């Protein structure tokens, strides 16, 4: 019920809720847009300052959000909102009643996958404008071709194609001609994550049993396989500063680091987030940088950094473990008590069921 | 002593900094304190990997390396988290010493494996794969005795 | 060599000099529109010079028993109940 004394202002103390956040890069700086229920929040990755909060609460929970240069694409119940500086610029209503639950943006195309395994392609009108706005076509992944769509990505240098990662298969669509170019062989366990490598035409797949596949999307083979037994894989990220490391993120809250060149395991950060709230939900390397931003469902967003190596001649074999850098956080459980600390309305004390006083 | 007097000491070799321009040699406990680091252990195992690759492992080096390794395991024998940090370093260098042709470096790896298995209870499958790697390149006679 | 050909890139035809990012992947000053497979190869070499090619992709694709068992295991001791007799030197004793 609308009120006549008090009007809603903000909901403070929230950093993440375990929607996989998006990173974006203006120039040479980075921002991190994390979902907090029905609003998102943009953070300055060099210092984790809150730049922006989305202007209005969406009518339902934001479920998939991405970020190109200036624009943030947030998918909630049916539709995709295109936001700049918090203020919404456009709203793309899909023609379905199915809930949109994945999206990618490449070229003039925004591609949004619903949960009835249909994919909606939207096109720019003229290639000089800012966001894809007009309806183009619809793609469908039927039960013959693949399972439920588990990720939707575009690995680079692929002229208007789309890698669709289903639960068992990897399809590759041409989104201008509406065609299914290539459907891979099946995978013997259900794949949960995907991340495109900075190696050319290679995607990395993460399964519900413990293995990372390095699929070569042009040969149709798999290049290598990394086995992490009894661990469901929830994140994949690649280091892109002349050190070929991979970072996998495990839903018991672990962040495991691999060297791909010499096939060893660099380090494991254990209990980086709570397993009960989802484990590590999104971990990503800021590219060109030795810092990786993780976020979990326990209302926490951290950064870890790799210091330069301690051996002055070897280096590549003596890899110093990742250390902690800045982080923001709030309560992981709903607060149980509230007080104002002073008469200026500046700080407020707040105690929660997770036994912390913030 | 001469190379320590004229050397400029790296940051991993930090405990030799009181034996530079000194008249007395570094002691064995200083050598174990040098080897007790983890980054130094990764550095020395890469050095041994290049030694084993270019086939330059000689028996005085294998004796010294094995002595310092089993003293590292002995020093860390009372903290399981340091032993567990230390297992995939020294078992990896045991695999890379067993994967060569020298009987001396093979029984050096035998010494490292026997001290490490009696220092902590390893897994059954790790012990079985260790005996598979032991038998998969067994060609000498003193190596057979140690094996 | 490749497991698919799509037959659309060959008959596409891109411009080059309309945006400053694609303005660098010309081989002449008279090129203005190029074919799609040529254009794909130009920005493939451009991707390769943004992110340089590592050695793990072309080096290898997938007595090593110990190395394999170490690369799969994460704990290295006996787990819970396959012990049946006490470990020495470190107890496990809670206070009630």
């Amino acid at each position: 019920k609308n009120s006549k004394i008090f009007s809603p202002f903000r909901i403070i103390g929230n950093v993440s809720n375990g929607v996989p956040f998006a990173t974006g890069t203006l120039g040479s700086t980075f921002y991190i847009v994390t979902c907090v229920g029905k609003t998102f929040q943009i953070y300055d990755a060099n210092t984790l300052h809150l730049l922006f909060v989305s202007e209005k609460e969406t009518p339902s929970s934001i479920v998939a959000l991405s970020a190109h240069f200036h624009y943030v694409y947030a998918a909630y119940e049916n539709k995709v909102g295109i936001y700049k500086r918090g203020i919404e610029e456009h709203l793309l209503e899909l023609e379905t009643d199915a809930n949109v639950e994945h999206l990618c943006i490449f070229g003039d195309y925004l591609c949004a996958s619903t949960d009835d395994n249909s994919i909606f392609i939207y096109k720019k009108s003229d290639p000089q404008d800012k966001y894809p706005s007009e309806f183009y076509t619809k793609l469908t992944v039927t039960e013959i071709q693949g399972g439920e769509i588990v990720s939707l990505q575009h690995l680079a240098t692929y002229l208007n194609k789309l890698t669709v990662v289903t639960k068992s298969n990897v399809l590759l669509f041409n989104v201008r001609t509406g065609k299914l170019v290539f459907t891979s062989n099946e995978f013997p366990d259900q794949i949960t994550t995907a991340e495109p490598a900075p190696v050319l035409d290679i995607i990395a797949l993460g399964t519900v049993t413990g293995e990372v596949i390095m699929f070569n999307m042009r040969k149709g083979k798999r290049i290598r396989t990394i086995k992490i037994p009894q661990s469901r894989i929830s994140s994949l990220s690649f280091r892109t500063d002349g050190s070929s490391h991979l970072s996998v993120g495990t839903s018991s809250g672990d962040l495991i680091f691999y060297d791909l060149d010499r096939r060893s395991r660099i380090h494991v950060l254990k209990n980086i987030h709570r397993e009960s709230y989802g484990g590590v939900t999104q971990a990503t390397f800021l590219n060109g940088q030795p810092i990786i931003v993780t976020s979990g469902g326990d209302n926490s967003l951290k950064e870890y950094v790799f210091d330069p190596s301690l051996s002055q001649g070897s280096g590549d074999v003596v890899v110093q473990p990742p250390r902690y850098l800045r982080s923001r956080g709030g309560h992981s459980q709903p607060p149980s008590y509230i007080a104002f600390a002073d008469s200026q309305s500046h700080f407020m004390l707040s105690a929660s069921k997770d036994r912390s006083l913030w | 002593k001469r190379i320590l007097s004229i050397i400029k000491l790296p940051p991993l070799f930090n405990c030799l900094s009181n034996f530079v321009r000194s008249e007395k040699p570094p002691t064995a406990l200083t050598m174990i304190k040098l080897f007790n680091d983890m980054d130094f252990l990764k550095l020395y195992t890469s050095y041994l990997d290049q030694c084993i690759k270019h086939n330059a492992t000689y028996t005085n080096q294998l004796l010294f390396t094995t002595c310092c390794f089993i003293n590292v395991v002995a020093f860390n024998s009372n903290n399981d988290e340091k032993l567990n940090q230390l297992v995939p370093i020294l078992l990896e260098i045991s695999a890379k010493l067993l994967a060569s042709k020298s009987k001396d470096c093979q029984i050096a790896a035998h010494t490292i494996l026997v001290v490490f298995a009696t220092a902590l209870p390893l897994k059954k499958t790790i012990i079985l794969a260790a005996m598979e790697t032991i038998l998969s390149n067994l060609d000498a006679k003193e190596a057979k005795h140690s094996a | 060599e490749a497991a698919w050909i799509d037959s659309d890139d060959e008959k596409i035809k891109v411009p080059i000099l309309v945006t400053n990012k694609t303005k660098k992947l010309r081989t002449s000053y008279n090129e203005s529109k190029i074919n799609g497979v040529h254009y794909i190869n130009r920005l493939r070499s451009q991707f390769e010079k943004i992110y340089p090619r590592p050695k793990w992709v072309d080096d290898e694709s997938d007595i090593n028993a110990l190395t394999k068992i170490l690369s799969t295991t994460y704990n290295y001791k006996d787990t819970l109940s396959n012990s049946k007799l006490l470990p020495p030197k470190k107890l496990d004793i809670v206070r009630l």
């Binding site: 070229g107 290639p127 030795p290 330069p308 | - | 035809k13």
Partner: peptide, 28 residues
């Protein structure tokens, strides 16, 4: 003296990234 595990002050650097807006072509 043991080895010195001190942390450096980390500053970000200028990185180049492939943007995929050139990965979409129109037909005549």
């Amino acid at each position: 003296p043991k080895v010195v595990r001190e942390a450096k002050k980390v500053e970000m650097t200028e990185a180049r990234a492939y943007n995929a807006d050139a990965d979409t072509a129109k037909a005549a």
